């Protein structure tokens, strides 16, 4: 599996991506058969034209951006967690959401399964 | 109280950062539920019961020395699961360091801590 410094480079490389909008590089980071489940709790997503449809629904518009508001969390396995904000629009207004996205990766360095802690709670107005 | 809610994840995980500060390790394994699961670090063989939670928090905090504060604000679930990123500060070969984690919490329906993971490694401790 991808080492610890694997990961934090992986999941920071996927912030990236988010923060420009490429909506192409980001499906090409999953594998196959993965997973998203975002918001948790909610069903989980599966399919590569599907991960690419959610992926345009949220970011197709544009005027969406993300940063880290901390490091990168890695395991020995594989997997990590990392807390940041996404600035997006709502209601006609600009808001905040803070997020904490759990990813594990697969033998390939592709995302296998994601996983987006955030609810009401976490949105602001500004 | 039930299933929690967001707002009450966020108070409970909140709550339990707190506990690790003043380092009460009665009142910690109090909050999880009695045949609750830590993986700790993520990757690690799960620890099964109240009492090996205990004994794995009496090895990690009764040392004393550990302080702890969140970093973020709780990020919380409708399904009664969290996940805060926190920082804990600690003594070790003569030096001051820092562990910066984020734990991913599932409560059960009474309100109890059924399965916590904690994130980190090596390369998230930071000495002096
Ligand atoms: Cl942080
Ligand atoms: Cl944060
Ligand atoms: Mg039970």
Not at 4 to 27: F, K, P, S
Not at 31 to 43: H, L, R, S
Not at 73 to 84: D, L, Q, T
Request: charged letters at 20%; glycine letters at 10%; a negative charge.
């Amino acid at each position: 599996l991808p080492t610890a410094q694997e990961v934090q480079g992986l999941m920071a490389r996927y912030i990236e991506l988010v923060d420009v909008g490429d909506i192409e590089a980001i499906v090409q980071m999953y594998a196959d058969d993965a997973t998203v489940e975002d918001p948790f709790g909610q069903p989980p997503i599966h399919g590569r034209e599907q991960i690419a449809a959610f992926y345009r629904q949220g970011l197709g518009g544009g005027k969406v951006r993300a940063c880290l508001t901390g490091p990168v969390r890695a395991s020995h396995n594989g997997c990590g967690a990392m807390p940041f904000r996404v600035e997006m629009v709502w209601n006609g207004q600009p808001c905040a959401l803070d997020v904490i996205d759990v990813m594990r990766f697969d033998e390939h360095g592709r995302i296998q399964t994601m996983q987006a802690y955030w609810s009401e709670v976490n949105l602001s107005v500004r």
